[PDB]
C-alpha cells in the first residue's frame, strides 16, 4: 500500500467547456464520460491503477509492472518505486530511445542491426531502456528487437517505458489496486488510442489529466533521467551512471530534444542513426558537412533548408527556424556520434 499512498493520479474534475466539439472539451473524451488547472481543473488523488499486466494475446507470455503517476510526482519518489517495490537494481546504463511517434518502416538491414544493437548493449551492462511505451514509432521496433531476443536468450532486459496513460487503448481495463489485470494486445485500426507494446517489462504510465494528448511523459522522462544520473554507481571512483540518447527517425520536435541533451550538463551523447529517415538523416547529413560545427557553407545550408521543408513539409521560414536549432545542435557534433548504416560507421 506504499504505491497507493505515495503517488497520485489526477482526475477530470472540471467545468466541462464546449470547446470545438461539445463532447471533446479540454480533456478530449466525450462530455458525459468526463468525471492541469487550466480548463481541466484536475484533482490529485491516490492512484487508481497499479499492479501487474498479463499481456493476453501476441503469444509470448510477459508480465509488466504498471504504475499510473502524475507528471508532478517527484523523481526521488519514482526511484523508490523502481528499486524497492518493483525490485530493480540501479542500472549501469540508461538508453533513452527518443524517436518518432508515427510508424516508420525502416530498411530490413537497419531493423536487424538496430535489433541486435540495442539488445546486447542492454544485456551486458544491465541497462534500463527508457523508451516511450505505446506500440507505434520507434517503440514498436524496440519491442520487435525485444521479440527477437526473448526467443533466443534468457537475460531480462529492463525496458522501463514512460508512455501516456491518456493515450493507452482500453485504459479502463487496467484499473485496479494490486490486481493482475489481463490486457488484450489487440489494436483496433480505427481507435486513435494505441495499445502498449507487450514486450516491455515495466511501465510508468503518465497522467496529464486529459485523454489523447501527449506531453506528460516529456517532463517526467527528463526529470527522471537527471535523477538517475545523479545517483552514482558502486565503482566509488566518482561516476554517475552514464545516460545515452539513441535516436532514430524522429519528428521535427526531436531536434529540440537533441539540443536539450547536448547542451545539458553533463552532455548526454546521442547515437543518432542514419538510414531511417526524417530527423535522424538531416542531423546525420548535417554531421557529415559540419567542419567546425555550424561551419556549413551557404549552399549546403540551403540544402538543409529544402530537406527540412520537404521531409517534414515545413514552410520556408520554419525550415530556417529548425536550422537555427540544428546549427546549435551541431556545434557540439563531438557528442553526436552517428552510427552510419552498414558502410563503415561502427
Amino acid at each position: 500500500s506504499w504505491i497507493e499512498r505515495a503517488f497520485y493520479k489526477r482526475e477530470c474534475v472540471h467545468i466541462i467547456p464546449s470547446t470545438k466539439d461539445p463532447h471533446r472539451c479540454c480533456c478530449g473524451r466525450l462530455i458525459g464520460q468526463h468525471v492541469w488547472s487550466i480548463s481541466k481543473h484536475t484533482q490529485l488523488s491516490p492512484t487508481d491503477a497499479f499492479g501487474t499486466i498479463e499481456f493476453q494475446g501476441g503469444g509470448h507470455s510477459n508480465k509488466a509492472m504498471y504504475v499510473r503517476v502524475s507528471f508532478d510526482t517527484k523523481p526521488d519518489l519514482l526511484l523508490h518505486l523502481m528499486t524497492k517495490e518493483w525490485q530493480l537494481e540501479l542500472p549501469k546504463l540508461l538508453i533513452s530511445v527518443h524517436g518518432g511517434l508515427q510508424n516508420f518502416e525502416l530498411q530490413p538491414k537497419l531493423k536487424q542491426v538496430f535489433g541486435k544493437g540495442l539488445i546486447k548493449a542492454a544485456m551486458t551492462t544491465g541497462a534500463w531502456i527508457f523508451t516511450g511505451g505505446v506500440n507505434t514509432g520507434v517503440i514498436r521496433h524496440v519491442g520487435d528487437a525485444l521479440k527477437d531476443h526473448a526467443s533466443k536468450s534468457r537475460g531480462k532486459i529492463c525496458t522501463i517505458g514512460i508512455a501516456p496513460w491518456g493515450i493507452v487503448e482500453n485504459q479502463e481495463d487496467l484499473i485496479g489496486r494490486d490486481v493482475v489485470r489481463p490486457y488484450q494486445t489487440m489494436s483496433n485500426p480505427m481507435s486513435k488510442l494505441t495499445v502498449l507494446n507487450s514486450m516491455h517489462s515495466h511501465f510508468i504510465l503518465a497522467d496529464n489529466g486529459t485523454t489523447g494528448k501527449y506531453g506528460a511523459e516529456v517532463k517526467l522522462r527528463r526529470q527522471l533521467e537527471k535523477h538517475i544520473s545523479l545517483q552514482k554507481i558502486n565503482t566509488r571512483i566518482g561516476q554517475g551512471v552514464p545516460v545515452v540518447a539513441l535516436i532514430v527517425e524522429g519528428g521535427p520536435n526531436v531536434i529540440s530534444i537533441v539540443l536539450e541533451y547536448l547542451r545539458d550538463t553533463p552532455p548526454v551523447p546521442v547515437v543518432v542513426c542514419d538510414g531511417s529517415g526524417r530527423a535522424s538523416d538531416i542531423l546525420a547529413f548535417g554531421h557529415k558537412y559540419s567542419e567546425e560545427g555550424g561551419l556549413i557553407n551557404e549552399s549546403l545550408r540551403d540544402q538543409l533548408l529544402v530537406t527540412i521543408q520537404k521531409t517534414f513539409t515545413y514552410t520556408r521560414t520554419q525550415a530556417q527556424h529548425l536550422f537555427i536549432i540544428l546549427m546549435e545542435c551541431m556545434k557540439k557534433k563531438e557528442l553526436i556520434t552517428v552510427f552510419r548504416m552498414g558502410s563503415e560507421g561502427h
Binding site: 507470455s61 508480465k63 536468450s153 534468457r154
Partner: protein, 91 residues
C-alpha cells in the same frame, strides 16, 4: 523406487499402535465414525494463493528453459550444422 510411493502412503494411513495393540486404535476409529455419522487420500501441501503464483511462474520459467535448450542443442549438433552449411553452399 516406484513402489516406495505405496510404502509411504499405506503406512501414513496405518494406525499408530502395533498390530498386537491395533485393537485399541480400531475401536477409536469405530467409535469416532459412529459419532460423526450420527452427527481424500494422499500427501498434498495445500499452498496459499500468493505462493501458488510463485510456483506457477517458476514453472513458466522451466517451460521457457526446456524448449530453449532443446532448440540450442538441435541448432548446435553436428547433424544440423552440416545440414545448414550444405544448404547455404547450395545457395
Amino acid at each position: 523406487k516406484f513402489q516406495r510411493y505405496q510404502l509411504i502412503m499405506t503406512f501414513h494411513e496405518r494406525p499408530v499402535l502395533p498390530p498386537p495393540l491395533i485393537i485399541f486404535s480400531h475401536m477409536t476409529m469405530i467409535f469416532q465414525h459412529l459419532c460423526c455419522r450420527w452427527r481424500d487420500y494422499g500427501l498434498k501441501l495445500f499452498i496459499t494463493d500468493d505462493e501458488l503464483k510463485k510456483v506457477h511462474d517458476f514453472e513458466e520459467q522451466c517451460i521457457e528453459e526446456y524448449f530453449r535448450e532443446k532448440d540450442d542443442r538441435f541448432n548446435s549438433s553436428n547433424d544440423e550444422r552440416i545440414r545448414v552449411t550444405s544448404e547455404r553452399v547450395e545457395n
